[PDB]
Amino acid sequence: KVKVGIIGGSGFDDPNLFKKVGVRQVTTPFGKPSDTLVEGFVGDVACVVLPRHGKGHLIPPSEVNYRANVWALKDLGCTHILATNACGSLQEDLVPGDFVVLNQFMDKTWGRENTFYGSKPDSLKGVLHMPMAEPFCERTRQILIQAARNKSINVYDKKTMDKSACIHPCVHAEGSAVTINGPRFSTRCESFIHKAMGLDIVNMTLVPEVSLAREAGLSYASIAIVTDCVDMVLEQFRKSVVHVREILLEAVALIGAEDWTKTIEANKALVMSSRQDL
Amino acid sequence: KVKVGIIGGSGFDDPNLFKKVGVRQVTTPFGKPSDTLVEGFVGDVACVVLPRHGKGHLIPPSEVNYRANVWALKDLGCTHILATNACGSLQEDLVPGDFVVLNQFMDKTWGRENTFYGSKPDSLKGVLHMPMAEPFCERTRQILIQAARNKSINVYDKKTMDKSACIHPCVHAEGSAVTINGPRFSTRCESFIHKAMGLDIVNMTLVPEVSLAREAGLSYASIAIVTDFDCVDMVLEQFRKSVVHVREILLEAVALIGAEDWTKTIEANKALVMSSRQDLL
Amino acid sequence: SKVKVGIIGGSGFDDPNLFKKVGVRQVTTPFGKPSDTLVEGFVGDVACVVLPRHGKGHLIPPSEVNYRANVWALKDLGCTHILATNACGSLQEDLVPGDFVVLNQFMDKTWGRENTFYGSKPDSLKGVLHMPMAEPFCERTRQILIQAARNKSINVYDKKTMDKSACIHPCVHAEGSAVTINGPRFSTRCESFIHKAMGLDIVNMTLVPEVSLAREAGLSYASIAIVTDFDVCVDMVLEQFRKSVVHVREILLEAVALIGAEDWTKTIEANKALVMSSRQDL
């Protein structure tokens, strides 16, 4: 059966997504997760919620233990991870209040543990070279988008629809993120360069979360929240969180409604075939 | 009220900017600075000098303790930091002997401690996400430029001047730097890519120094010396002359800083830090 | 030994056996242990030393390879040259799986690796070294690799001097640029498109800081890249890569002989001098 883990970013430091059966603390071979995990159900589907930055948002993007977080979710029996990521827009059609179901990224992070495998004592034995050309689980991506349609939230698909048919607030059916290391925001120079490369949004937390999920044999999809006076932004972002929560809840249900036997098996075999030491 | 900190790069390993009234060997929560700090006065203005690489230039750019350097200056009561930086050019209008008052950068460093805040045992508690769109203190930049004018040095501003106004040597009124980690220089491939991105100069020491200064609530401006990394004797003499010019600019700049009131700007700097504390918001 | 050729074997060369072993050296360096034991012997009359970058069982990922120990160990055994192999993915349509590239440029996207012998840390040599890297390889040694290809009847394609219709596969490209990513994951499509738009020819994980450290050590370094396919298709690619390994072996052995056939006194002196002149602490 499926079990859906949820990694909550900003706006989700302490989310009340459902009636919790209980709070759980776990450990992993790679250290402690960001915080304790909230266990519960969405209908008949098991769900686990984990705040990326910890309840008090005391852990910056570069110091988040992504391995521990993803591995904890794996060990709890999760088959899927849905993640939220607060982001800044680099393109005119992506405005604050919009969401993006990412399908691509460019990595500018460093100093973070980005693989479970290696030759150091603090890692699993072996050399894993994972294909990442299309880094997300496509079935899971499409579920997030269908969830938005189901909650009457506008979906904008730039290859199917013309620019004039972009109606805000909307979920962009695709998009690419540049993930910077942080914690500082980009300079104007950097943003112009990132925009020139054709990137859609900038964030700090997508990588290596997405990579580690694939290493763990888990189906992963990310929904980014465009947030780009402070009180107004908070109100807009608060409004966005309501809709993101709606999307996440519907998506968990949608995942539970389908059979994932072949896809899961494919996830696991992809890990096996990427082992270069074997 | 104000106190001007100066971080000396190459050519300033043993600054000697003024008669040292006192020296301070400090220890910060983030380690020891590059060397002892030298205190004194330029006119009536309090000033503190620190060689970024240490007296013997034994410390490479990636191993400089920028946090300790910036914090030590902060702890001494500095309100401003002026920094010098030796660089190579990526564009034809910038030639050896020129200077650049930077207003932008693109960061390609790594493995340096670039923030005071975080969840590590030695971090200040909290998460700080500073805006860096215009990463320098604009008032302090304009002071460097005006200081150059005051010392009869050509100032070139491509935004408002024809290219015929670019008379060498000149201080370029704006410019973007790529900061590479070092210690090696770039390949031709890398240089071509940086040039294509529209970057003006390349250096190894600007980041995270500029970032950490802003986290500290300090006003920071950088003056880059364009030199040649490709006859050695003529280049060295040229760089020697450049060092003299920068010394003059720095001295005039300290004087110009102390002549203005910085109450509002200092308050705004401190506020920006507090407003960027995500753990608090 | 006036000249002695160090060889760093990458994927396909975990357990190389390029010549009869004469001496198996278990060495330590100031920067730690090399990826494996070093195997000394001869190719004809030329002294030669071979070392597997990833160790025998290929257990060491690109980002965890001790490039300093590997280069320094070879320097310590008296090597004057380093020839290195590396597997890579193609970013351009003219470079197909089965081709080889004698690289002349790179763009570095590695991090977290020790990339210099010098510093202020106790784990480094005293001093600050700022090496020029505009053309990061030993040009003479590059031309040896290419001439070696010719001597073994392998197609050589030079884009600068030859027409595009003369690009006959499989072939050795006489020049090329690599982006070196940190790994261990391969690139996203987004990253590959960006790298291609920058004009880069191939992507690898092992070139940097190996090339940089070899120059720091005053050694003549040249690299030959094996273009493979990272996208039963697997059975076919494996077969192609096996043939690539065989041909690169022939190139390396012929290159060693070619190096042994010339004087290197001036070039070696220049390598040593470039190190000394790059000391910013003097």
mmCIF file with all atom_site columns, N, CA and C in Angstrom, chain C residues 6-26:
data_model
loop_
_atom_site.group_PDB
_atom_site.id
_atom_site.type_symbol
_atom_site.label_atom_id
_atom_site.label_alt_id
_atom_site.label_comp_id
_atom_site.label_asym_id
_atom_site.label_entity_id
_atom_site.label_seq_id
_atom_site.pdbx_PDB_ins_code
_atom_site.Cartn_x
_atom_site.Cartn_y
_atom_site.Cartn_z
_atom_site.occupancy
_atom_site.B_iso_or_equiv
_atom_site.pdbx_formal_charge
_atom_site.auth_seq_id
_atom_site.auth_comp_id
_atom_site.auth_asym_id
_atom_site.auth_atom_id
_atom_site.pdbx_PDB_model_num
ATOM 1  N N  . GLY C 1 6  ? 53.506 8.791  -14.989 1.00 0.00 ? 6  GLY C N  1
ATOM 2  C CA . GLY C 1 6  ? 52.429 8.381  -14.116 1.00 0.00 ? 6  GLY C CA 1
ATOM 3  C C  . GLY C 1 6  ? 51.142 8.258  -14.909 1.00 0.00 ? 6  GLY C C  1
ATOM 4  N N  . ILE C 1 7  ? 50.330 7.264  -14.563 1.00 0.00 ? 7  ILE C N  1
ATOM 5  C CA . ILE C 1 7  ? 49.059 7.047  -15.236 1.00 0.00 ? 7  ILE C CA 1
ATOM 6  C C  . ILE C 1 7  ? 47.927 6.885  -14.227 1.00 0.00 ? 7  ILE C C  1
ATOM 7  N N  . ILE C 1 8  ? 46.941 7.772  -14.306 1.00 0.00 ? 8  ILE C N  1
ATOM 8  C CA . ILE C 1 8  ? 45.752 7.663  -13.471 1.00 0.00 ? 8  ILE C CA 1
ATOM 9  C C  . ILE C 1 8  ? 44.604 7.082  -14.286 1.00 0.00 ? 8  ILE C C  1
ATOM 10 N N  . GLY C 1 9  ? 44.243 5.842  -13.979 1.00 0.00 ? 9  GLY C N  1
ATOM 11 C CA . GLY C 1 9  ? 43.183 5.166  -14.696 1.00 0.00 ? 9  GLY C CA 1
ATOM 12 C C  . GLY C 1 9  ? 41.836 5.358  -14.027 1.00 0.00 ? 9  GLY C C  1
ATOM 13 N N  . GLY C 1 10 ? 40.859 5.828  -14.796 1.00 0.00 ? 10 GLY C N  1
ATOM 14 C CA . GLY C 1 10 ? 39.508 6.010  -14.294 1.00 0.00 ? 10 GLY C CA 1
ATOM 15 C C  . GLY C 1 10 ? 38.644 4.785  -14.522 1.00 0.00 ? 10 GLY C C  1
ATOM 16 N N  . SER C 1 11 ? 37.348 5.005  -14.739 1.00 0.00 ? 11 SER C N  1
ATOM 17 C CA . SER C 1 11 ? 36.419 3.918  -15.029 1.00 0.00 ? 11 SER C CA 1
ATOM 18 C C  . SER C 1 11 ? 36.916 3.104  -16.215 1.00 0.00 ? 11 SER C C  1
ATOM 19 N N  . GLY C 1 12 ? 36.843 1.784  -16.087 1.00 0.00 ? 12 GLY C N  1
ATOM 20 C CA . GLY C 1 12 ? 37.399 0.885  -17.078 1.00 0.00 ? 12 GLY C CA 1
ATOM 21 C C  . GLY C 1 12 ? 38.827 0.492  -16.736 1.00 0.00 ? 12 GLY C C  1
ATOM 22 N N  . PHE C 1 13 ? 39.451 1.241  -15.830 1.00 0.00 ? 13 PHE C N  1
ATOM 23 C CA . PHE C 1 13 ? 40.844 0.999  -15.450 1.00 0.00 ? 13 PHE C CA 1
ATOM 24 C C  . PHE C 1 13 ? 41.027 0.807  -13.942 1.00 0.00 ? 13 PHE C C  1
ATOM 25 N N  . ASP C 1 14 ? 39.984 0.336  -13.263 1.00 0.00 ? 14 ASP C N  1
ATOM 26 C CA . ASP C 1 14 ? 40.046 0.069  -11.825 1.00 0.00 ? 14 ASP C CA 1
ATOM 27 C C  . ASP C 1 14 ? 41.154 -0.928 -11.480 1.00 0.00 ? 14 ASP C C  1
ATOM 28 N N  . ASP C 1 15 ? 41.355 -1.904 -12.357 1.00 0.00 ? 15 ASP C N  1
ATOM 29 C CA . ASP C 1 15 ? 42.433 -2.874 -12.209 1.00 0.00 ? 15 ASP C CA 1
ATOM 30 C C  . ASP C 1 15 ? 43.089 -3.039 -13.575 1.00 0.00 ? 15 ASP C C  1
ATOM 31 N N  . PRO C 1 16 ? 43.944 -2.074 -13.944 1.00 0.00 ? 16 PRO C N  1
ATOM 32 C CA . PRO C 1 16 ? 44.446 -1.844 -15.309 1.00 0.00 ? 16 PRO C CA 1
ATOM 33 C C  . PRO C 1 16 ? 45.345 -2.936 -15.896 1.00 0.00 ? 16 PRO C C  1
ATOM 34 N N  . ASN C 1 17 ? 46.469 -3.228 -15.247 1.00 0.00 ? 17 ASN C N  1
ATOM 35 C CA . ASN C 1 17 ? 47.478 -4.126 -15.810 1.00 0.00 ? 17 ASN C CA 1
ATOM 36 C C  . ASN C 1 17 ? 47.947 -3.654 -17.188 1.00 0.00 ? 17 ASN C C  1
ATOM 37 N N  . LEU C 1 18 ? 48.655 -2.528 -17.218 1.00 0.00 ? 18 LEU C N  1
ATOM 38 C CA . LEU C 1 18 ? 49.128 -1.960 -18.475 1.00 0.00 ? 18 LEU C CA 1
ATOM 39 C C  . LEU C 1 18 ? 50.483 -2.547 -18.869 1.00 0.00 ? 18 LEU C C  1
ATOM 40 N N  . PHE C 1 19 ? 51.170 -3.131 -17.894 1.00 0.00 ? 19 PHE C N  1
ATOM 41 C CA . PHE C 1 19 ? 52.491 -3.715 -18.103 1.00 0.00 ? 19 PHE C CA 1
ATOM 42 C C  . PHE C 1 19 ? 52.777 -4.715 -16.992 1.00 0.00 ? 19 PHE C C  1
ATOM 43 N N  . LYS C 1 20 ? 53.850 -5.487 -17.139 1.00 0.00 ? 20 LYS C N  1
ATOM 44 C CA . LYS C 1 20 ? 54.253 -6.416 -16.088 1.00 0.00 ? 20 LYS C CA 1
ATOM 45 C C  . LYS C 1 20 ? 54.638 -5.646 -14.825 1.00 0.00 ? 20 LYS C C  1
ATOM 46 N N  . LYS C 1 21 ? 54.044 -6.018 -13.696 1.00 0.00 ? 21 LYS C N  1
ATOM 47 C CA . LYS C 1 21 ? 54.352 -5.352 -12.438 1.00 0.00 ? 21 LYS C CA 1
ATOM 48 C C  . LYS C 1 21 ? 55.793 -5.650 -12.027 1.00 0.00 ? 21 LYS C C  1
ATOM 49 N N  . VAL C 1 22 ? 56.504 -4.624 -11.579 1.00 0.00 ? 22 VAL C N  1
ATOM 50 C CA . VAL C 1 22 ? 57.850 -4.811 -11.060 1.00 0.00 ? 22 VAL C CA 1
ATOM 51 C C  . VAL C 1 22 ? 57.836 -4.540 -9.564  1.00 0.00 ? 22 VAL C C  1
ATOM 52 N N  . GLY C 1 23 ? 57.126 -3.486 -9.176  1.00 0.00 ? 23 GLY C N  1
ATOM 53 C CA . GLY C 1 23 ? 57.037 -3.096 -7.785  1.00 0.00 ? 23 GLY C CA 1
ATOM 54 C C  . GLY C 1 23 ? 55.679 -2.530 -7.426  1.00 0.00 ? 23 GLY C C  1
ATOM 55 N N  . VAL C 1 24 ? 55.085 -3.080 -6.372  1.00 0.00 ? 24 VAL C N  1
ATOM 56 C CA . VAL C 1 24 ? 53.813 -2.598 -5.860  1.00 0.00 ? 24 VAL C CA 1
ATOM 57 C C  . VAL C 1 24 ? 54.064 -1.776 -4.605  1.00 0.00 ? 24 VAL C C  1
ATOM 58 N N  . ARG C 1 25 ? 53.808 -0.477 -4.696  1.00 0.00 ? 25 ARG C N  1
ATOM 59 C CA . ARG C 1 25 ? 54.130 0.452  -3.621  1.00 0.00 ? 25 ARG C CA 1
ATOM 60 C C  . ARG C 1 25 ? 52.904 0.840  -2.802  1.00 0.00 ? 25 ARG C C  1
ATOM 61 N N  . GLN C 1 26 ? 52.975 0.603  -1.497  1.00 0.00 ? 26 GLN C N  1
ATOM 62 C CA . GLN C 1 26 ? 51.948 1.069  -0.574  1.00 0.00 ? 26 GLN C CA 1
ATOM 63 C C  . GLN C 1 26 ? 52.468 2.333  0.084   1.00 0.00 ? 26 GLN C C  1
#
